[PDB]
Every structure is written in structure tokens, then in C-alpha cells.
Amino acid sequence: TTWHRPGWTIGELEAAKAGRTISVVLPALNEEATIESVIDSISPLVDGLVDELIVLDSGSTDDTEIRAIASGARVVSREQALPEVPVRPGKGEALWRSLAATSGDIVVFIDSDLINPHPLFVPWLVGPLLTGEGIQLVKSFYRGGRVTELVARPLLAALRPELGCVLQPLSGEYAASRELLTSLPFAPGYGVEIGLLIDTFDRLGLDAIAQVNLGVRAHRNRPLDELGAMSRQVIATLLSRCGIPDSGVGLTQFLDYTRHTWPVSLVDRPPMKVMR
Amino acid sequence: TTWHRPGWTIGELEAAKAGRTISVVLPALNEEATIESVIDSISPLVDGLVDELIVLDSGSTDDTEIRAIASGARVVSREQALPEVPVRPGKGEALWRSLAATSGDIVVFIDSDLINPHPLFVPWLVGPLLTGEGIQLVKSFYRGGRVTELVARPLLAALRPELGCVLQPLSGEYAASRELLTSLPFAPGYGVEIGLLIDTFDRLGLDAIAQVNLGVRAHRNRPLDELGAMSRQVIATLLSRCGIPDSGVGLTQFLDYTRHTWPVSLVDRPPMKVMR
């Protein structure tokens, strides 16, 4: 079911929990400028609709951690989330680790780089999980997304056209059941969102997936070269899910000219279940 | 060999022809604003280094044709290039047809949407073909190319990493031997450049390919949605060359929201040789 405008009240949603718990995770790498506003947008839900909120600090070297703490948030490093396992770089590692630092029956992810996010983001994402039937994953969409419109959607049309109806496959804002998340491998780096989406679909089909309009997104837009690497990992992850061998060769860029090669990973983390 | 700065004189290049001829093709769909300057940048070479110059008018409905004529250019419609074969849409069709409207041993393509192009573009592109050994294809590069850096190069790294060294795989400015071009199929739409590059490489290897710095490119930059479709066709063509089945499903876009689906083609034109 694709929603265009939520309506559930916070109280209705709370009633619908029926014993289920909700954890919220904000992954963060150097987001000192935006993190406070994001935390503040959600913390009023804590001890109510939300049972648990954490910042997964992914190696920040700015004031991200101290500002998050000063916002009353529990901050968890990659190392603290799962200390027995050495840390790998990239976003997917942080999200995967975050499963071990939470216990909610439902887990909600929100990027920490959002500019003044609506306080109803979380309620809007959990709606279908709480009041739906068979929904295990909820993606957000909103109203310029160069990677999404040039890379991910066109590749989905080519290789998983059934997912053509997903407006924001790379959305960093989404919610899912712990049962699902701990049953899926996690792709490395920026491949994580697309992997979760494709894996979910391949395993449960579209009926287990919803998407909700969160309105409009403001975010620290980004340099082309970093987008190159992101696109590369998205590709790697997507090709893998489609049974296609990726060279494992990183994107090289020429900035006469100088050359730089960005890392790409063909290694997923296994389902957090195997870590029990 | 990758050049960074040409030096050949026009006279040296002319001497090097040794009986070989040179045709120049400007494909054009609704470029009334830029076409004159492009024609004017090249016509001084005609009857000298360049034996032949044409505009391949690809269905323009603006003043492209009359302005090109007024610039002294021979204008050739898709229909006139090959009248026995009904016309298909897209850039690849125009370029393929252009082989039948030219007779140069060497063929040079230049996009008609360039803003005040250097008059040495053509000389710089033909340099390696004339003075090199074994070069059959010359690509340009220059100094924001969203499709190139987000789609084509990252996919090449994944699937033909040997072509990672190509700075502008989608460049509309390039030159090649008739022998090569008439021996290759032509991908439809915006897939044409990438197809020619991959096919050339697969068949003759890197040693037959050069790239030359033309400096900097100014061009009528472009709406995201049109870039989506372009990216989609590039993908289709690239997947095909890599032995990967494309769904044939067009990209859909949602502009509440309204939906539009863009065409994609999995059909190449065969080598112009078969039309003999």
C-alpha cells in the first residue's frame, strides 16, 4: 500500500503496539550541524511510542557525539554495538551493528543529516507496520536525487522492474521488523538500503513493503566525486542481488590530471541471527 | 595513447592523409541556437583537411535546418540518408544513417549543441588516426557530467574495468575509420556512444583506441527527467554488451503525483556493411 498522507494519531499508534516495542536508530558520521535537531524531533516520543532511541556514532571526529549527548541521546559507537567483531568502514556496517545495540520488535532508521525534520516522521513510518497486515518494511519518499533517478531507479527498471514503483529506494528513512532485519545480510557502505530493499522483495514480495510520503527533504547536498563512489557501491550491491559478477574494481577519478581510486566492497555482513 | 595537448599543424595533418578522406557529421535535433557556430567552426577546413561536411537533421521542428543551410552546410534528413528504410527515433539511428550519407575513409562526429567550439576540435580528433599506428577510434575528453560520472564510468568499472581509463565514454565528439564503423552495430537512442566504445574494445582492444583533450565543453545543460531516460538506455546498451538480459522495461517517473514512462530499446541496427 502506498500512502500519500498519514493520519494516524500518536495515541492510536501507541494503542496498536500491543506489546511490540519500537527502537529508533540515528546513524551518524560527522553530523554535528544537524544531529541535535534530529534528536530533538524524536525524543518527545521516548517512553511513549518509542521505547528506545540511539545514535550510532560511526567514527565521528567532529562534535557530533557531545552534541548528541547534550541532547539527551544514548550514543553508541560501532565498537560498543558489537565489541567482539573488528569494525569495518561504511554505513552498512553501522546499521548492522545497530541491531545488536537495540531490542525493539520494530526498528526505525533516520539519517542524522536531515535539516529540521518533521516530528511525525517516525509515527508515519511505523503506521503500516502497526495497523497493516503483512508489512515488514516501510520506505519513505518525498519531494535533486541524482543517484536515485540516474542510477538506482533505472537499474531497477532494467533488472527488477517490479520495484519500479518505489519512489525512493535509497531513502535513509525507513522502518522494519527486527525479525526481518536480523534475517537479512547487510550490504557494505552505501549499498545497504538498496540491498535491504531487493532482498526483502525477493524473499517476501511487494505485499510486505510499503512506502509513505514524509513530505520534503532538506539535506547537506553533496560533491560529485563522493556521489561516484556511492553509485559504484549501489551498483555492486544491486548487481550482486541480480546474480551478476562485479569486477570488484573501484571507481577511479581524474581531478594536468591526478588520479584517485575509491574503495568498493563485495562483502556483505551475514544476518545478525548468526551472531546469537 | 592518451593525449593531453595536441600540436599537429593543419598542414601536417593534411599531408598525412595520403589519399584517405575525411567526412564530418553534425547530428542535430532542434539545435537552432548553436548549430551555426558549430558549422562555422569547421567549414574553413572543407576542400582541405575535411572533404565533406554534413548536418544530419534528426527531425528538427525549429529553424535548425534553415540556419544550417544559411551557414553553407549540406543538410541531410534521416529519410534522405537511407530512404529505403523507415526511420526510427533516437540519436543512434541518425548516426548510423549518416554512414550512408558519407564516404570518408574517416568519419568525425561532433554534437551540434556545443557553445562556440574550438576550430581545432576536428584536427585534434583525427590526429591519432592520421599519425598513429593501429588507432581506429578516438574519443574526446574535457573539463557537470552526472550521467558520465554516476552511471557510465561506475558501470564500466563494474563490468569492463579495462575501460576505466576512459575519461568521457559518452563523449559526442569522436572520430573513427569507416571500416570500423560500418563493421559495428549501432545501439539505439543515447546508447550509441557507449556501445561503440565497448564493441571497439571487445573487438580490437585498448590499443586501437585513443582519447584527446579538447579543453572545456559548454553545452545546454539539461533536465533530470531526460537524463533518467538517457541513463536507462545507456544501461540497456551496456548490460547487453556484457551479456546481461535487460528487462526491456522503460523507466517510469512520478511528477498528488502523475506518472510517465519513457521508451527504451533493446534493438541495435546491424553493421552498415550488410546494407551493401
UniProtKB/Swiss-Prot annotation, chains A, B:
Record-listed (2R)-3-phosphoglycerate binding positions: G145, R146, V147, T148, N221
One BP annotation, GO: UDP-alpha-D-glucose metabolic process
The reaction(s) this protein catalyses: an NDP-alpha-D-glucose + (2R)-3-phosphoglycerate = (2R)-2-O-(alpha-D-glucopyranosyl)-3-phospho-glycerate + a ribonucleoside 5'-diphosphate + H(+); (2R)-3-phosphoglycerate + UDP-alpha-D-glucose = (2R)-2-O-(alpha-D-glucopyranosyl)-3-phospho-glycerate + UDP + H(+)
Pfam families to which the protein is assigned, alphabetical: Glycos_transf_2 (PF00535)
Note on how the cofactor is bound: Requires divalent cations for activity. Mg(2+) gives the maximal activity, but the enzyme can also use Ca(2+), Mn(2+), Fe(2+) or Co(2+) ions, but not Zn(2+) or Cu(2+) ions.
Segments crossing the lipid bilayer: none
Family matches, as InterPro entries: Glyco_trans_2-like, Glycosyltransferase_2, Nucleotide-diphossugar_trans
Keyword Metal-binding: yes
This enzyme's EC code(s): 2.4.1.266
Binding site for (2R)-2-O-(alpha-D-glucopyranosyl)-3-phospho-glycerate: K91, G145, R146, V147, T148, R217
Disulfide bridge partners, by residue number: none
Binding site for UDP-alpha-D-glucose: 27-31, 58, 91, 111-112, 190-193, 217-222
GO MF annotations, alphabetized: hexosyltransferase activity; magnesium ion binding; protein homodimerization activity
Entry keywords, A to Z: Calcium, Cobalt, Glycosyltransferase, Iron, Magnesium, Manganese, Metal-binding, Transferase
Broad class of enzyme this protein falls into: transferase
Cofactors (names): Mg(2+); Ca(2+); Mn(2+); Fe(2+)
Binding positions (Mn(2+)): D113, H219
Function as written in the Swiss-Prot or TrEMBL entry: Involved in the biosynthesis of 6-O-methylglucose lipopolysaccarides (MGLPs). Catalyzes the transfer of the glucose moiety from UDP-alpha-D-glucose (UDP-Glc) to the position 2 of 3-phospho-D-glycerate (3-PGA) to form glucosyl-3-phosphoglycerate (GPG).
Assembly behavior: Homodimer.
Further comment: Was identified as a high-confidence drug target. The glucosyltransferase GpgS does not possess a putative nucleophile residue that could result in the formation of a glycosyl-enzyme covalent intermediate. Therefore, it is expected that the reaction would proceed through a front-side substrate-assisted SNi-type mechanism where the breaking of the glucosidic bond is stabilized by the interaction of the acceptor hydrogen atom O3 of the acceptor 3-PGA with the beta-phosphate of the nucleotide sugar.
Family: Belongs to the glycosyltransferase 2 family.
Protein name: Glucosyl-3-phosphoglycerate synthase
Taxonomic lineage: Bacteria, Bacillati, Actinomycetota, Actinomycetes, Mycobacteriales
Gene designation per UniProt: gpgS
